[PDB]
Design a protein around this nucleic acid. Structure first.
Lengths: 96, 167, 167
RNA sequence: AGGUAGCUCAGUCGGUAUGAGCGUCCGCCUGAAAAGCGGAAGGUCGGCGGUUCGAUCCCGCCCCUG
């Protein structure tokens, strides 16, 4: 259902920002962006509808899917940056 | 091999690991760096994990022609150990320098052989234990005279790096 | 430092420990001894316990002027380990020589890294495990061709020191 | 003519990459190994841009080898 996708983006962008662990975010991904995700089921249903309803219904699906991707990508890079930074601190030694 | 004294100091300088990198000084002149390479550099470069590296500028190391004239004392030595608690980020070389500065001329050798952390010590702290060898040049050093030099070494460590004698 | 190959063989020669003494040979010529000193010699002499010693005759070591011309194969290597049970008094160098003699030219490196005794092996026995690195000079060696060289190495160890492949 | 997982390759004709061997990492096995089986992780599909609601797939240019 087009324009009803805004409830799936809000449910994803808040579940993505809530994850503070790479393992938690890995499960949040497949639930909201995986092959079985509702946002993925909206893209698979773009070749069965007629041609006249394909240029506009897909623009609302691609906009709702790219909005959730950016929230995931920016959250994945953030959590991986914090992980990498913590390794450098934990690996500190007395060089003298 | 160059017959020069060198100090190693904490530093951050790519491609070395910011927590496992030392800058090498001869006197107050920097001559290079050493330590483990940055894990991100290692990953992007396809290098083995944990690869380490060192680079020095030989032309910055002045050629030394020392003519030692050592005087060896044959008198017996006194062996004593001291255990000092400092903040965890106090470099071990600074604690030893402070001990050496307080011990005076009677101190012949100092060697760190234990670095301990745990609930016995407390958080943000670490315990260091040094083996001290005292020796007089003209007499058999007494246990008390050595302890006076040890007490002065402990007092010096307390003033310079905040070392607390362990109890 | 002398650029000579040396073999060490069990020997009994005072003041060395009869069970921890090696005689040193260059070819078939004896050049000296090494190992731990006899505990009775150490006791009577007031020496530190466990004192070790070595003495070689330099004039018996012929001066060598080798001109190496190595050929380095760039082709990939095959890594395989072999575990061999021998009698406990079979010297480990004899087992390695037998493995090397059976492996042939494909064997680039052999390294002993485990010496094991226990009820799994049996009394009067010991198990030795070697790391083998095979490499061909003109082709990428296959896993099978390396195993054929390994099987021949195991057969050679069986015939010369009675080594039994561990199972 | 091809470029696709770290490697070697099969394959996908605009709206789901799907994979196979090696390698790697685990599990069984060994006191520990190797070798074995067994499981698994593992992919802006050569780069920059058109076109398109959407490009590994079509168009332009460029990089790479035969």
């Amino acid at each position: 259902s087009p324009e009803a996708l805004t409830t799936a983006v809000d449910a994803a962008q808040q579940a993505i920002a809530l994850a503070d662990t790479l393992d938690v975010l890995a499960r949040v991904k497949t639930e909201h962006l995986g092959d079985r995700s509702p946002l993925a089921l909206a893209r698979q249903a773009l070749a069965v509808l007629p041609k006249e309803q394909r240029a506009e219904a897909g623009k609302r699906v691609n906009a709702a899917r790219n909005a959730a991707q950016r929230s995931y990508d920016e959250r994945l890079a953030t959590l991986r940056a914090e992980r990498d930074a913590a390794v450098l601190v934990a690996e500190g030694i007395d060089v003298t | 091999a160059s017959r020069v004294d060198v100090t190693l100091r904490p530093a951050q300088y790519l491609p070395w690991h910011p927590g496992r990198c030392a800058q090498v000084f001869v006197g107050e002149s920097s001559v290079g760096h050493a330590g483990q390479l940055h894990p991100a550099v290692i990953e992007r470069s396809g290098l083995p994990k944990g690869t380490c590296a060192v680079e020095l500028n030989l032309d910055a190391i002045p050629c030394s022609a020392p003519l030692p004239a050592p005087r060896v004392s044959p008198y017996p030595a006194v062996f004593q150990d001291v255990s000092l608690v400092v903040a965890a980020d106090i470099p071990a070389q600074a604690v030893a320098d402070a001990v050496r500065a307080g011990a005076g001329d009677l101190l012949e050798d100092i060697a760190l052989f234990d670095v301990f952390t745990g609930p016995q010590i407390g958080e943000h702290r670490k315990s260091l234990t040094f083996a001290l060898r005292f020796r007089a040049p003209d007499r058999t050093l007494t246990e008390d005279d050595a302890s006076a030099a040890r007490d002065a070494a402990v007092q010096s460590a307390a003033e310079r790096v905040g070392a607390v004698l362990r109890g």
